[PDB]
């Protein structure tokens, strides 16, 4: 009898397959001849974009320990090429077939395929990915279309990439939506670029949820009246967050689009523009789009007639080429029959950690948890270790399964509270989720075991990437020690984010919100760093056009657009003139102090002032309890 059957092989299954091979656990892989989105993109020649996520968080530890030399954003092509190298390694283990049904019994499953071949497996892993409605617009939709109006109903990473490809052909973009959360994928810290995922210091939640909340949420919730922030210049981008019923911030179920702010795009690519664009580094600055009016927001309830293909805003009945419904995404599960008979119904909240479903035996879900920021690799790598330990160690299987029902209840209380199930429940802050899996497995770190200030930085400030937990113990990866030193050496041991937490320990929500926005350039949606980039933007559009052999005339005028843009940008034409310290000042001093006491013993530190008292209490954080683990 087959010990393990993995269904679907793309990206998510790689780490688990690796661990099963290591313990010589008997496994077979079944995966469709047709492959995935990435093969459609490959063969239609549309691997012509880059990831929104850092190398550090998008490629697995066993690759990073060989190939990390610096932070960069991988291209679509580099991501697919990495899928194809790992497929080649394991191709002998893969049956090319399509699973149509799983019949789940007490300690085994009967798997049906389209060939009609049947397989019996004690443990079954689904790593089948998602059906995504937007994939067609990326796969197929045309790059010649020009000067048309498009209406999007929702704003996600796919819509934002499509908008990036549309804008250089003078296509006009209308977002009719109930707000969206966008974040600069990169932040300049004392002149050095940090991806946003490197600045979240998530283990500060254990100190207090209130402190973690005021440190993180001012770019998301409208807490500052600083007139430089997009959610003040363009109030329509604001969301209804009344659904949120949890002390854990940022909450599970929050989604953001991550985008290149034009200032950082310039710093990276100005020097060799066309060649960078040709590689898939595309400018997707939604905030620069709202600034220059190439995108406009209109109310959620703005009247639209699909019969005549017109939207009614600014007293103008406006004609559009295409309405884009908006990315719904569904896990590609085959029919699963409970005890051979009753169809299983998938709901994220009814699985433990997005992996273990109820009323099924020895069936695990790999790849159906989405990270709030950073790449999927961090999530799937930790899920792979969790599944590996559940499949190979019966004691661990029993320990998790015995009280599965109450772990799930305790998880849902902590992270969702009394909120109704939502379609984005599957979205988790990466640094909570990786840490949660690490504590479940026992490869986590103990704050009490920190000895030096250096150790405290590693524990609190070093990002909770999967490879953080493969330094030592049960799932150690060779070379992770040198990886961490490289990453620490390049990011000043994450002293800046440690200092951020220190700066707001004694503030309230509102004070923290003002402080986070006092910078010359604050991290997210800073509308002061747009105007001075218009010259660069034309160099960009021209370079893009040259790359894609496009002709277009920038003298054509859509006076109806102008009335709608000016109607749209009314609040901005009021607020932006009100524009015009602390964060820049506090960071620069804090970092000097911290770097000075790096190798100082914590326990020994004497009685600036209560910042030492605070640093000492980090050995004994008061909000460490996670009842889905304990
Ligand atoms: C446009 C786009 C951009 C993305 N950008 C990023 C990014 O910047 N950073 C990031 O970290 N992530 C990103 N992702 C998300 C993620 O990294 C990819 O979706 C990834 O391909 C998911 O890998 P997977 O193994 O879960 O699924 P897939 O890659 O889809 O692989 C699943 C495989 O299972 C097969 N299969 C499905 N059902 C069956 C069945 N019943 N029987 C047999 N075989 C089956 C499929 O044919 C496929 O070959 C992006 C996704 C998309 C679509
Ligand atoms: N005070 C932090 C906020 C931050 C940093 N990184 C983040 C990522 C997601 C979200 Br929501 C917030 C952040 C910063 O500005 O560096």
Q: Confirm or reject: Cβ of 331 under 6 Å from ligand 1.
A: no
- The tally of CA atoms less than 13 A away on the side-chain side of residue 441 is 30
For ligand 2, the distance from its centroid to the CA atom of residue 326, given in whole angstroms, is 26
Ligand at shortest distance from the CA of 516: 2
- Count of CB atoms within 10 A of residue 584's CB? 14
Strand order in the sheet with 322-324: 295-298, 172-176, 149-152, 322-324
CA 424 – CA 284 distance, rounded (Å): 23
Q: Confirm or reject: Cβ of 127 under 6 Å from ligand 1.
A: yes
- Is 255 known to sit in a ligand binding site? yes
The region, left, alpha or beta by phi > 0 then psi within -120 to 50, assigned to residue 510 is alpha
CA 331 – CA 369 distance, rounded (Å): 10
Is 570 exposed, middle or buried (CB count within 10 Å of its CB: 0-12, 13-18, 19+)?
Answer: exposed
3-state SS assignment for residue 523: coil
- Is 181 known to sit in a ligand binding site? yes
Contacts of residue 551, Cβ cutoff 8 Å, sequence gap at least 6:
545
Ligand 1, residue 12: give the atom nearest the CA.
Answer: 25
Ligand 2, residue 256: give the atom nearest the CA.
Answer: 11
Q: Give Cα separations from 6 to 89, 123, 161, 353, 548 (angstroms).
A: 16, 9, 32, 19, 40
For ligand 2, the distance from its centroid to the CA atom of residue 195, given in whole angstroms, is 10
Domain architecture of the chain: domains with CATH: 2-36+73-131+329-441 (3.50.50.60), 135-328+526-580 (no CATH)
For ligand 1, the distance from its centroid to the CA atom of residue 131, given in whole angstroms, is 9
- Is 178 known to sit in a ligand binding site? yes
CA 627 – CA 180 distance, rounded (Å): 32
- Is 376 known to sit in a ligand binding site? yes
CB 153, CB 134: distance < 8 Å: no
Ligand 2, residue 220: give the atom nearest the CA.
Answer: 11
Cβ < 6 A, ligand 2 pocket: 183, 196, 199-200, 215-216, 219-220, 250, 373, 500, 516, 523
- Percent helix, strand and coil across the chain, each rounded to 5? 45, 15, 40
For ligand 1, the distance from its centroid to the CA atom of residue 435, given in whole angstroms, is 24
Ligand 1, residue 50: give the atom nearest the CA.
Answer: 8
Ligand at shortest distance from the CA of 195: 2
Q: Confirm or reject: Cβ of 31 under 6 Å from ligand 1.
A: yes
Retrieve residue 79's tokens.
């991501």
3-state SS assignment for residue 476: coil
CA 131 – CA 158 distance, rounded (Å): 13
Dihedral over Cα of 61, 66, 67, 69: its sign: positive
Beta bridge partners of residue 172, listed in sequence order: 149
Tell me which H or E stretch contains 383: helix 377-392
Ligand at shortest distance from the CA of 185: 2
- Is 430 known to sit in a ligand binding site? no
- Is 99 known to sit in a ligand binding site? yes
For 339, phi then psi, to 5°, come to: 45, 35
HEC assignment per residue over 39-88: HHHHHCCCCCCECCCCHHHHCCHHHHHHHCCCCCCCEHHHHHHHHHHHHH
Dihedral over Cα of 39, 41, 42, 47: its sign: negative
- Is 501 known to sit in a ligand binding site? no
CA 37 – CA 132 distance, rounded (Å): 9
- Is 412 known to sit in a ligand binding site? no
Q: Where are the alpha helices (DSSP H) in 173-331?
A: 209-216, 230-233, 262-269, 273-279, 286-292
For ligand 2, the distance from its centroid to the CA atom of residue 196, given in whole angstroms, is 6
Nearest-CA residue for ligand 1 atom 15 is 376
Is 226 exposed, middle or buried (CB count within 10 Å of its CB: 0-12, 13-18, 19+)?
Answer: buried
Q: Confirm or reject: Cβ of 466 under 6 Å from ligand 1.
A: no
Residue with tokens 């995404």: 329
Retrieve residue 56's tokens.
């550090």
For ligand 1, the distance from its centroid to the CA atom of residue 503, given in whole angstroms, is 40
Ligand 1, residue 51: give the atom nearest the CA.
Answer: 8
Ligand 2, residue 254: give the atom nearest the CA.
Answer: 11
For ligand 1, the distance from its centroid to the CA atom of residue 76, given in whole angstroms, is 12
Retrieve residue 70's tokens.
């610096």
Nearest-CA residue for ligand 2 atom 8 is 196
- Is 158 known to sit in a ligand binding site? yes
CA 440 – CA 387 distance, rounded (Å): 11
Would you list the DSSP string of 395-461? HHHHHHHTTHHHHHHHHHHHHTTTPPP-TTTTEE-HHHHHHHHHHHHT-PPPGGG--BHHHHHHHHT
Q: Confirm or reject: Cβ of 465 under 6 Å from ligand 1.
A: no
CB 10, CB 366: distance < 8 Å: no
Give the strand pairing for 2-7 and 118-126. parallel
Q: Confirm or reject: Cβ of 35 under 6 Å from ligand 1.
A: yes
Retrieve residue 527's tokens.
């509308």
């Amino acid at each position: 009898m087959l010990e393990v059957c993995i269904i679907g092989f793309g990206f998510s299954a790689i780490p688990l397959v690796r661990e099963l091979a290591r313990t010589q656990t008997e496994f077979q892989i079944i995966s469709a001849e047709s492959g995935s989105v990435w093969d459609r993109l490959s063969e239609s020649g549309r691997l012509d974009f880059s990831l929104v996520s850092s190398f550090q968080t998008s490629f697995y530890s066993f690759d990073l320990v060989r190939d990390y030399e610096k932070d960069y954003y991988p291209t679509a092509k580099q991501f697919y090429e990495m899928h194809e190298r790992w497929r080649s390694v394991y191709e002998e283990k893969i049956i090319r077939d399509f699973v149509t049904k799983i019949e789940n019994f007490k300690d085994y499953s009967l798997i049906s395929t389209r060939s009609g071949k049947t397989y019996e497996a004690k443990h079954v892993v689904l790593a089948t990915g998602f059906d995504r409605l937007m994939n067609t617009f990326l796969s197929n939709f045309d790059n010649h279309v020009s000067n048309k109006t498009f209406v999007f109903d929702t704003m996600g990473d796919s819509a934002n990439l499509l908008i990036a490809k549309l804008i250089p052909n003078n296509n006009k973009i209308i977002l009719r939506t109930n707000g969206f959360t966008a974040l600069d994928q990169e932040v300049q810290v004392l002149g050095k670029p940090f991806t946003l995922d490197q600045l979240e210091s998530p283990n500060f939640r254990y100190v207090s949820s209130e402190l973690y909340d005021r440190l993180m949420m001012s770019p998301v919730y409208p807490r500052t009246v600083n007139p430089a922030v997009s959610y003040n210049q363009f109030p329509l981008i604001r969301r209804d967050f009344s659904w949120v019923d949890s002390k854990s911030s940022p909450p599970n179920g929050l989604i953001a689009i991550k985008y290149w702010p034009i200032d950082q795009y310039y710093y990276h690519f100005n020097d060799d523009l066309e060649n960078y664009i040709s590689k898939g580094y595309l400018l997707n600055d939604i905030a620069m789009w709202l600034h220059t009016g190439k995108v406009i927001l209109v109310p959620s309830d703005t009247p639209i007639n699909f019969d005549k293909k017109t939207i009614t805003y600014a007293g103008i009945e406006r004609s559009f080429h295409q309405y884009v419904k908006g990315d719904a995404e569904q896990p590609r599960l085959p029919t699963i029959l409970i005890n051979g008979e009753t169809p299983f119904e998938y709901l994220y909240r009814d699985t433990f950690m997005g992996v273990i479903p109820q009323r099924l035996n020895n069936i695990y879900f790999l790849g159906y948890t989405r990270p709030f920021t950073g790449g999927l690799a961090n999530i799937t790598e930790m899920q792979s270790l969790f599944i590996h330990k559940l499949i190979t160690q019966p004691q661990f299987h029993q320990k998790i399964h015995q009280n599965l029902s109450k772990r799930i209840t305790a998880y849902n209380q902590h992270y969702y509270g009394a909120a109704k199930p939502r379609k984005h429940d599957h979205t988790v802050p990466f640094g909570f989720y990786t840490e949660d899996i690490a504590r479940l497995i026992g490869i986590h770190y103990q704050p009490n075991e920190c000895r030096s200030v250096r150790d405290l930085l590693f524990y609190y400030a070093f990002p909770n990437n999967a490879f953080k937990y493969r330094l030592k113990g049960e799932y150690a990866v060779d070379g992770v020690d040198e990886l961490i030193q490289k990453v620490n050496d390049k990011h000043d041991h994450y002293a800046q984010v440690f200092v951020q937490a220190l700066s707001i320990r004694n503030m309230n929500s509102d004070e923290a919100a003002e402080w986070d926005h006092s910078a010359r350039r604050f991290s997210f949606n800073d509308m002061r760093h747009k105007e001075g980039y218009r010259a660069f933007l034309d160099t960009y559009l021209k370079a893009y056009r040259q790359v894609e052999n496009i002709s277009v005339d920038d003298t054509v005028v859509d006076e109806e657009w102008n009335f709608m843009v000016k109607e749209a940008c009314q609040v901005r034409d009021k607020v932006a003139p009100n524009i015009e310290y602390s964060k820049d000042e506090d960071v620069n001093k804090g970092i000097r102090l911290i770097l000075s006491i790096l190798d100082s013993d914590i326990s020994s530190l004497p009685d600036e002032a209560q910042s030492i008292e605070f640093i000492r209490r980090l050995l004994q954080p008061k909000n460490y309890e996670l009842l889905f683990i304990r």
